[PDB]
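Cross-posted from the bioinformatics board.
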Amino acid sequence: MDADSLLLSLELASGSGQGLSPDRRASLLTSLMLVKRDYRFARVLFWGRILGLVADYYIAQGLSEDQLAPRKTLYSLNCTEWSLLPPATEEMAMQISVVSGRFMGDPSHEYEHQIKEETRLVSIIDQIDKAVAIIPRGALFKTPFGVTHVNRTFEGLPLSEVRKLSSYFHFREADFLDSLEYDIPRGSWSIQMERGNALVVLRSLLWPGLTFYHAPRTKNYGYIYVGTGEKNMDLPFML
Amino acid sequence: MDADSLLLSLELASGSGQGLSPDRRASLLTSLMLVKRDYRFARVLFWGRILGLVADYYIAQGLSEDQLAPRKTLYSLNCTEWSLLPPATEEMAMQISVVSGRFMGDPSHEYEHVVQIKEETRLVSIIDQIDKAVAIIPRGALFKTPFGVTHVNRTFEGLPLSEVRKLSSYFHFREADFLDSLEYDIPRGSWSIQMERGNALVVLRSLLWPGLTFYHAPRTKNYGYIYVGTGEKNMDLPFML
Amino acid sequence: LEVAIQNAKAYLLSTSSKSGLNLYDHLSKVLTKILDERPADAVDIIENISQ
Amino acid sequence: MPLPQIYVEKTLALIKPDVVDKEEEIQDIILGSGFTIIQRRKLHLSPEHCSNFYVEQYGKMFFPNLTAYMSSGPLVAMILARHKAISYWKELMGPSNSLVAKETHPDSLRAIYGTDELRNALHGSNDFAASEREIRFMFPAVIIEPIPIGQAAKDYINLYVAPTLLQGLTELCKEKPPDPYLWLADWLMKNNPNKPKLCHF
Amino acid sequence: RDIEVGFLPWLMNEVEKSMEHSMVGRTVLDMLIRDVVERRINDYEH
Amino acid sequence: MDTAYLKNCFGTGLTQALAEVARVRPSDPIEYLAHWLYHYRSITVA
């Protein structure tokens, strides 16, 4: 989510209940502004949290012009001390498949199944972005120059279009993006209305902790993954 | 401020430091949302608050489908029971001109400057005097056609930071290239330009009517004004500046 | 090129019966709304002013 | 000019690194005076750029301080345009030498912001043809001039483009290569007469 | 070999015609600006 | 002559190329032509 989600508690307004304290919120505002300074990103959205057993990894994601670029991930344990997380590949996706369990706060932790916790952080954040990173329909407009920009004239979805999974897009490489109605399982997405139905909350069931914010009246949107960081393989049993 | 955007860019976050509690905020959200149903308003605003002496007034407006406030006005001691405040006029404002002091909080209260001037009339006269005019509109937020139709500028993008620092890039909300700018106002220097949290939000403080703070998010279609004050004009502004 | 601009006026638009709109009137309205202070990035906005 | 067409006059306008900090007031006076800004851009001219920008007069203005005052920090260039653009911009500026403008033109921007002869706060077009030359230098790929519809385009092509394009296409005709555009474009890049040959090895 | 007489003369004529068509486009655009804005000041003040 | 081969091969492309170059008047027309031909593929073939 953008900085507008850190001037007000947009995260906890979704009713998921997990988010940032005002301490972390103000610290994150200053730190993500400094990240946009130090790293010349077009925008610096707060990706979310990986709730560990010792400390939580506060995650930020760099956005280029060129928003479907291979987005650059950053991590921080004490919020402000932001550090450039390495990018993800297919080998590191295959590497962590033998490991299961909750994240440890120290990213130097080792698993004997060695495997670094930093590699787990990189791979799990990549998997969450490829699976359940949400963009509402029409928020991004494929520019004729081979580059994706913000559709800066985007009006929020009509309330008729709110209830359809077709009106929401996977924020990744592929109206250009893939819609959520093919995201198997068919019931894998939960759509609910809060705050007088001026608020659409769309939570991932396959990756619990994701909660996508959207205000239909305006263009205020964003997604945050605040959760344990594992994939709910039990989803078809649970549906 | 917009009734749906009251949470966004909170009143206490505007730096004036006077605003609503969560109790009033939730009650005001649902009550203005129902006011959209009860009255045929195109949009409903929270005009602001008047502290008074015994009970606070909570005010709402008021827009028709003109997209420029004529306007109707509502008032309520709580944030639940909204009552239609009848509009002011020249004679009504003439009676309040001999009335001074803070608001009481009882609409049925009378004054002796004698004309039995009701607190209800004092409320509407003060509201329209504030709205005729220290309410603020950013440059380009709305526009007027050659056919006499006002339109909210859907393609508005906020003001650039260069235009933020000038009073020329802000308009009085009252009707008057379409509306009068704030750099035509009396006394000169009556508007305090300010910057909080860097360039995240503009804050304009009215020095004629104390408690009025106008909020504008640069580069974005988030703006609005609110009056949280005493309900009496700071005529003593010339001795300050 | 006076004959050419005469032909240009002559075209715009022998009215397209598929929609009943005119290039002259359509682009005129598009430019009229643009000349109410759209920003320097107005070149990227005409695709949905046309809509 | 006495066509059906109607005409915009355009002028360059610069701010030096000792005045860029007051960019905002200068832009406010520029807009308030009636100018319209077409494009902004932040520059940092190395001495090679300084030697090329004044190339119409760098062969007489042997002032190393004049190169430093473009190179000692960033610049703010603008295209301005309004009714009689160059003369109105000259009227706001005043004399080119700020030492004269300080005492004789109180209203001048150069008096308000400038310091001395070489520390002039502003530089802009002193002539329409000079306006095209400096604007085509500093902001490439921005159309500013009347289009050469007639024989002037043919002369331009025959003097710059054709002496290379003819010979390159001639060799393209001898080879008859597949997907001929690669042969032409790579030939033009490799054997440009106005550039040296690059050996990336 | 002798393309200097063959093909470049045709292409120079085509550059001339394409620039003429471009000028026609610029002219038509300019008439559009006049029409829109003259309709604006005249009707706005009435 | 070799006109017919290059009649078919280039056609509209060189016309638009030198029309744009004459309109722009860059400092290096030849490099501009090469880059424009690259871009012309990048729109047409793709």
